[PDB]
Design a protein around this ligand. Structure first.
Ligand SMILES: [Mg+2]
Ligand SMILES: [Mg+2]
Ligand SMILES: [Mg+2]
Ligand SMILES: [Mg+2]
Ligand SMILES: [Mg+2]
Ligand SMILES: [Mg+2]
Ligand SMILES: [Mg+2]
Ligand SMILES: [Mg+2]
Ligand SMILES: [Mg+2]
Ligand SMILES: [Mg+2]
Ligand SMILES: [Mg+2]
Ligand SMILES: [Mg+2]
Ligand SMILES: [Mg+2]
Ligand SMILES: [Mg+2]
Ligand SMILES: [Mg+2]
Ligand SMILES: [Mg+2]
Ligand SMILES: [Mg+2]
Ligand SMILES: [Mg+2]
Ligand SMILES: [Mg+2]
Ligand SMILES: [Mg+2]
Ligand SMILES: [Mg+2]
Ligand SMILES: [Mg+2]
Ligand SMILES: [Mg+2]
Ligand SMILES: [Mg+2]
Lengths: 420, 414, 418, 416
């Protein structure tokens, strides 16, 4: 049924470079700040190293592009499309690690070395704690937005009496949007719905959904439009061991321990949870600021940018430093806490660089039938929308294409790579 | 006496792809929840990153498969069998690490830096502690279920006699965690010396030496393994010391130091860091030349894929609000723990034919009398627990339509 | 339209070696000691392993240089320029790690494991703490000084919800003595942290700069980066929070309010301390030759204006030495009888191999060079950098044609087969 | 003078496989439990991951072996000997790390961050502490038992410090490897029995004398060896007891008042071997003994072979607990705690048959090298006083190499 694009897409010797120039995002890493009463107007966006960046790269329609000489194809019988053959994800700002926390984290005891009986809980024993998250680098490239997976609240059958009030778990797929949170060491789950107390994870995810890329689904899709290519590097270890306050929903069964007495009469909560740590960041392990040459994709789509668009998805927690800002409210000769206000800001700097190869397609009755079943919108647009409900970082390159490759960094690299 | 399958199994140019699609397991990482109607029925299974996953992969009988053209062999004199030539173990979910513990762990003192005399008094000094286990990745492939080794109570100091037991590793068996491959249920009577997810369980380690040395090599067509741990903390045990330190190894104390402290030490392990670069999975294995004599031949039209992967052992915190109120109160919330595992098994099989001469029939009959009987020329494994993966209806000849199929075609130049 | 220097710069077989000999800097790692009342009289300079070292390397003008035989070009139509083809940044002193701190660091609570309610009272809870910074090695070489990036206060200008300072990304020339980022970011701490206590004293009144690699790599002519190497690393050693008012409160949808003991919310103004971790010989970028054969940009090592800029950060020798003087000698130890000092030193040895080049100044090439930099033709007869601070390295009298008499020269001859 | 065995040992195309099958040791990692009846009889042996395992592998005498066809040599002028050309040290049990300790360790103060004045020990300040030792993997192969080095007390001969002497000895099965406290006779050099954990405090820890074994003329001790050691300092303590050598006065300014009584500078660290990983394993893989660095290229003179192993990467000690009295609530006195350690080995060999023509020149050469070779050939045993793990392969030699794991690996690797 499905065939490689190499069998019906003809490559030309025409190459073009396109660069986004510097892209900047500046905001609060823990939450967005709204303007009242407009609870829907964002004054300060949420900008965090733990966010997916999903760039929707717009390319100029090659069939309406002003080429100096169009004698390389026949518009009566052929249509043009761009193919991505080179990519470099520029990253500015120094390497660094940010931290996240909760002024009311649901941590009760430290359970690593000393947690003797008896335990005297109360009604509110939450603590103001912070941590450094799991480290993640990844880059996804395709002509279709990426698919994520996360656990959310499912539906339980009301037939039989519930042996547990644990919420039912369902694995959801969804498009990863720009700004979505990556998993941080506590799983890819909807914390807003599955953690009702709002205190079991830090505030930058406690009311969010953390998504993980569904690599298995995207790799098995027939046409392979999601993953032309990808890199990923994750790492974490357990930094600390705590337990939760609150009622233990599922009691330890009686065959797993001998009951205590006296000091040990009242069993402590075995609702354990670890804190993650991403450990060290290093230049040597960087995935970015280096060229990717998309020569042969594992899927059937070998870098063909159908619809004259492209999707670059990035996670990079190796520059997650959060800057401390401090203003002086009242100037005095001696230090007073109440004379200053503390703020936290995070920034992200990208510079997307591309090398595109012009391709032509001879529209025979057989190829037209193939492309129609693959995606009818391809032929319609060639003259031979539903993604607007999602949020992407728009990168318009319609006016950025240049045939002079050697005038740009990645272009020079491609010419040396290809022998041109 | 034993010969390579290459000498009597003839290979064809017929290849088939088969995949299980997404396989999900969801449950409680520490213990199963039983039905209120029948305490022997499991309602929420025990699902842990420290379990063996033993998939029993069922293949369609090629001698009864609906091939469009059968002119490539003669059923009057030959029989067919699949050979596994490629495998990829897909693993979903993010990398991560879970923890396990015990509300009444038998830890007495911390013996790392400061543990002066006299020793604390007590009849129950257990503590509520947790830890992160030794890290293990492994994959085993064969047409016979894997054999594990573990220590149990043997046959008869009052120390229990130790016996090394071999057994089939079943789906859901626990891997060793840093405290050894032993039957903790029978060898630790107090139920408090290891966390609750293994204190009433048996931890098994693969008996690689036994499996590699078997004549026909049905157990290990191929395997990979990566273990790691270090000692995170140093504790000692409460309870009477069964074997006192001999008098020639110390000068006796006196007064405050007269009552010797327990030298029943035990460490807590740690698996350290998990990293993408160390992953054994999500990559193709090409089973070209097995070290044993069975070069990937799936006798009985079945295949066993055994996996341990603790690098995705995250345990999710879930919390329900029993009573909604404007200020926080612990009694208004219930805390739960759940763990998930996501697999996607992908295979490439090669059709093979065997000419059943008097010499080959004799050889095979001695190897496994069931083979010829099932060929027309009660299953002893049904008492064991595996995760059956039924690929009877999943075989396809269009390799290039699937990820592993495309990798195989490039690898082999086809 | 920019073209490679290979297309209009002709290479000769003339090579010269030049070395700076030993370069030493000695001072206080945390601050300069100025004259009691005089501002521009520095008694002890600030010298730290966290400083950029930016060497402005002066070369002899080849058009005025006394070659033993000048019969290799035509002054009527050609001019000469040096090309850098070999470099080794010599580093003395042992590998080591220094620490920096603040006697009044704005650390309130340790938020790693135990930080229960209620919050401690007080108007000044600052503490005397130190830390070891993010580790950085880097070397940049070009004929133009490097460009840095850092965050500073932007236009005042979005005020009803927050009074946070406006942020703007500023580009500037990195000067000798500028501070590299340390784990708290590349920002102007002097203006953006008004309490002067949120970072150690060696950066709290300074601007930390990070090289703007992206800008320097995309400049049309490529004069900034003939070649560069970089190696950064850090992890989070500790977790603290800040004292002072929280400027942007946590939205109410991210938590359930406390009560009684937990009624007054603690500060979520968290901040980590960095650690550069281990330094090792095998990770060194220095004390090894770099052969500048083919640059990534269009300037393939051409030292226009007869100068060269070598920029270095090297925190792997950041040991700060303890010095103690005895004011009064007595038979028993008394703290008041001694004075404690801290000193840091840096030892460099810059080594170069240069290749003489000639340019035939045709009408086409003259037009190209004039558009590139009009000073080139004017200086040939065919300074806006003085407002900046650099470590001046004068090699005008250091050029030698006897390459095999010097370490890097022998390495060059062996490398090229000459 | 000394020449390679390649010059006078003729190689045949006859190969044989032999394996020990599973070898198991089970015991107490800290001490043996002696005769519950009488006499030096061990009921529970000392079995530790920090012990040397020295296997004395006995081969069948090829000059008396039942070869199906003996026309390949002439016993009137030739004798046969085995040469080792392949080995694999099988290791069972999971990777892991054990700990060792002392209920009365001579640790006084923690000297890492806070150790203020004044500080004087009482009469008994010992503590119940444990630690994880330096990590060591090593394997040595030869036809002669390995030589170890260790420090002991020298001759009696401004200080009362015991004289030190470097001793050489044969490493015996069960000997302790160095653990991070050095290769010394702790039994004689630490008279208080509390300065190191109980599993070495009355033992001698030996280190292989690589330099002595590599320089021996004939090279019988080390056909081949691998080693991997590692440790860091986990904690810093000092000792109680009188400091034998006071710090000289020129190295400090005296204290006064509460600092007038100087604290002991008898420091000592605790080691840690750090992480164990599969990727660092030396075992469970074949060694092809193709070209030895010494002159003996794998010739098993006397029809025996010595395989020495240290492997602390499976040093897990198992906890066992018996219930003396069953009750509905937990009580410490109702249970007894035990510690057990196990070791699992599977030694696999490929041997190549060799013949030696006994010319006048070779007989003289072999007689000077070792006269017993010719005597046993007919052309007591001083090693019986030592303790080795005996591995009898006399009945285990097989010519069907492809029926066994290492045989198949050897055939595939050699192109046979
Ligand atoms: Mg296109
Ligand atoms: Mg959801
Ligand atoms: Mg939500
Ligand atoms: Mg599992
Ligand atoms: Mg993955
Ligand atoms: Mg107890
Ligand atoms: Mg058992
Ligand atoms: Mg066994
Ligand atoms: Mg064997
Ligand atoms: Mg078989
Ligand atoms: Mg991994
Ligand atoms: Mg996970
Ligand atoms: Mg897992
Ligand atoms: Mg040096
Ligand atoms: Mg406090
Ligand atoms: Mg910029
Ligand atoms: Mg270094
Ligand atoms: Mg050098
Ligand atoms: Mg330095
Ligand atoms: Mg003095
Ligand atoms: Mg070695
Ligand atoms: Mg091994
Ligand atoms: Mg092996
Ligand atoms: Mg061991």
């Amino acid at each position: 049924k499905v065939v490689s694009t190499d069998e019906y897409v003809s490559r030309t010797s025409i190459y073009y470079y396109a660069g986004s120039s510097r892209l900047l995002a500046v905001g609060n890493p823990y939450f967005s700040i709204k303007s009242p009463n407009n609870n829907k107007k964002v004054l300060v966006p949420k900008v965090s190293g733990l966010q997916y960046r999903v760039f929707r790269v717009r390319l100029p329609d090659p069939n309406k592009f002003g080429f100096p000489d169009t004698s390389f194809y026949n518009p009566d019988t052929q249509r043009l499309v761009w193919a991505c053959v080179g990519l470099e994800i520029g990253r500015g700002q120094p390497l660094g690690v940010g931290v996240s926390g909760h002024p009311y984290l649901n941590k009760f005891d430290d359970t690593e070395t000393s947690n003797r009986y008896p335990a005297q809980p109360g009604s509110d024993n939450r603590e103001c704690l912070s941590m450094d998250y799991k480290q993640t680098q990844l880059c996804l490239i395709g002509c279709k937005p990426p698919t994520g997976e996360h656990w959310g609240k499912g539906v339980a059958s009301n037939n039989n009496a519930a042996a547990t009030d644990c919420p039912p778990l369902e694995l959801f797929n969804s498009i990863i949007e720009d700004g979505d949170m990556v998993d941080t060491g506590f799983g890819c789950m909807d914390f807003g719905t599955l953690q009702a107390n709002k205190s079991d994870v830090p505030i930058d995810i406690c009311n969010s959904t953390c998504k993980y890329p569904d690599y298995l689904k995207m790799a098995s899709e027939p046409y392979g439009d999601s993953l032309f290519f990808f890199l990923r590097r994750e790492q974490m270890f357990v930094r600390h061991f705590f337990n939760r306050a609150g009622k233990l929903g599922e009691a330890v069964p009686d065959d797993l321990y001998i009951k205590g007495s006296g000091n040990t009469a009242v069993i402590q909560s075995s609702a354990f949870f670890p804190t993650p740590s991403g450990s060290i960041v290093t230049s040597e392990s960087q995935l970015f600021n280096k060229p990717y040459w998309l020569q042969r994709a594992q899927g059937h789509n070998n870098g063909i940018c159908w619809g004259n668009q492209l999707f670059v998805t990035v996670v990079d927690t190796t520059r997650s430093t959060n800057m401390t800002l401090c203003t002086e409210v009242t100037k005095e000769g001696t230090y007073k806490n109440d004379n200053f206000k503390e703020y936290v800001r995070h920034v992200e700097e990208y510079d997307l660089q591309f090398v595109f190869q012009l391709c032509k397609i001879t529209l025979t009755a057989e190829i037209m039938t193939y492309i129609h079943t693959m995606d009818s919108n391809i032929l319609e647009d060639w003259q031979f929308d539903p993604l607007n409900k999602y949020t992407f970082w728009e990168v318009n390159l319609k006016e950025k294409f240049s045939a002079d490759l050697d005038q740009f960094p990645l272009g020079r690299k491609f010419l040396l790579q290809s022998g041109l």
